[PDB]
Design a protein around this ligand. Sequence first.
Ligand code: IYR
Ligand code: IYR
Lengths: 308, 308
Amino acid sequence: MDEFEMIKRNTSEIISEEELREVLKKDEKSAYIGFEPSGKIHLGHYLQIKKMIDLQNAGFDIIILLADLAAYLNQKGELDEIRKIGDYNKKVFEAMGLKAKYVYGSEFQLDKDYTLNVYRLALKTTLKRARRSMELIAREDENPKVAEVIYPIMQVNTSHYLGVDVAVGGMEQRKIHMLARELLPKKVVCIHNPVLTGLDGEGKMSSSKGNFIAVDDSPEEIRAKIKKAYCPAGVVEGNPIMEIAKYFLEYPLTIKRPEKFGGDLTVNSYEELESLFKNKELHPMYLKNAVAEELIKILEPIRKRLLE
Amino acid sequence: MDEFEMIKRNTSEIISEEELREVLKKDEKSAYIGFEPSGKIHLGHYLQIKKMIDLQNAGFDIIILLADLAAYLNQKGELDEIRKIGDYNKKVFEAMGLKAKYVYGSEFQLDKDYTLNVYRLALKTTLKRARRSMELIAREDENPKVAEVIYPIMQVNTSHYLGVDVAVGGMEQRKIHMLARELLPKKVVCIHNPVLTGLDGEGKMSSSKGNFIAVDDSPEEIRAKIKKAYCPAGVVEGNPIMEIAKYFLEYPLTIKRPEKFGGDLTVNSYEELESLFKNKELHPMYLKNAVAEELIKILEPIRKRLLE
Ligand SMILES: N[C@@H](Cc1ccc(O)c(I)c1)C(=O)O
Ligand SMILES: N[C@@H](Cc1ccc(O)c(I)c1)C(=O)O
């Protein structure tokens, strides 16, 4: 697996692969991802940080935007408290093994030159397009605020301002990124990560929906969350436990199981696991026990650094 | 007529009269009006400048905002060319006899602190409310831009920033002013001037509709415009010529007319003129001739200063 394939592994899409290939040739290249500060950092965040680590290993300088101003526009509270959560998020990201340059949006997104560019972009972006770009990001509001449409153009300008070669985000960010690629002078290569399913199988995993596993959850808590998670036999689509096996576990994977139920099985790839589960040769209970124990070991050093 | 009544004369509404009364008691009070720079300065502009002059005579310090940034957000062109028109507008306003402090929006509306307040206001203003406030101001656009909703909150913040006691504008500005009075810590007294009717009777007078008399039009041009203007006998409502008699002429007004048609008539007030015209005792032709000649003399010193 070369660098391109390492970067591509477990991503939903890369816009565009040809452009990424041109970027990889350079000695100096940079990539960023931004996150509205979150009280709990979960597997969805970890999935993306893992991807930033892949880029870093491929020679990219990484910038992590603690998107405080965006969170502010998206009704997450006052800037002061939001920045505090941002500082906590930085510590968690560092505990994940990512060394990068962390910047707070408000450090530069209120500067006269930034603002003028935001207003120039506002002249080129239709209200309809801006609202559509925020469908999967905007905080639920029966009476949508003007702030909601300022948010996407502020995000489009970040890539321009940072001068990055690559922007990373979950698939929820794809419409904002399409806007950026259409409006900015320089097209940024966009790498989109899949959106994890919530533990109960209802909708996507989210900090606001309480359907996630946080990276610092205790082992006992992880086991309890996985035990009650949606995981119908033979069903892979929308199955959060299979998603965890695909995105976080390493193979070969040894699945412990009593001899009376088939004995231990060693799966050499997620594809093999997917095969077994689909044919109902692996019961949800044993898939769950293996995923919980392996996930606990994966997260252990992060929780340990955060509690130390 | 005291100061309050002088300020109130020919206005559509004052929000609120009690508040204006409290303001008038102060030794130091200020008022502003903003205009998106216009290629031609017309009677609608003059009507408002006349009102600013009334306020100045009542002891107010006047600030005229050459609203370049707003015009930019409202698709009037590039800031550089817009500012140039703004400078021309200042010269016309000075030729009207107004001495005031002229400021360009872009001088302060892109500052970090201004912008943060704009975003704070964006969190409190619904998209629906912002669009409604722009119905009579926004440039026609089949695909409304995000810029359209940034415009009203930028305008709400101007009063806050300038610290004025009074904001003046045409009735088209009333929804933005209502928003300002609801959102700002200090309620600004809003004085609204009537919207003049276009010369052809179709819709309101506008720089973009070419249905106006510019203050520097030649006498010959004024006569031609008034000659072809909508002015049905006995009809006062939506009659631009009667509006001109009401808002710009001084009384007693002598209306020249051949003896065979009734001879000259001296009207001591606009109300008397309105009475005569309604009862069809004054023919459109003679109302028009008198209005054109008197308007020419009213505008003469302005055109002269602009051509000198
Ligand atoms: N939209 C991201 C946060 C984010 C990302 C990048 C960026 O430039 C900005 I401004 C904000 C989220 O949903 O968390
Ligand atoms: N809306 C006015 C222009 C204007 C006025 C005041 C203000 O604070 C701003 I920002 C702009 C117009 O229609 O010309």
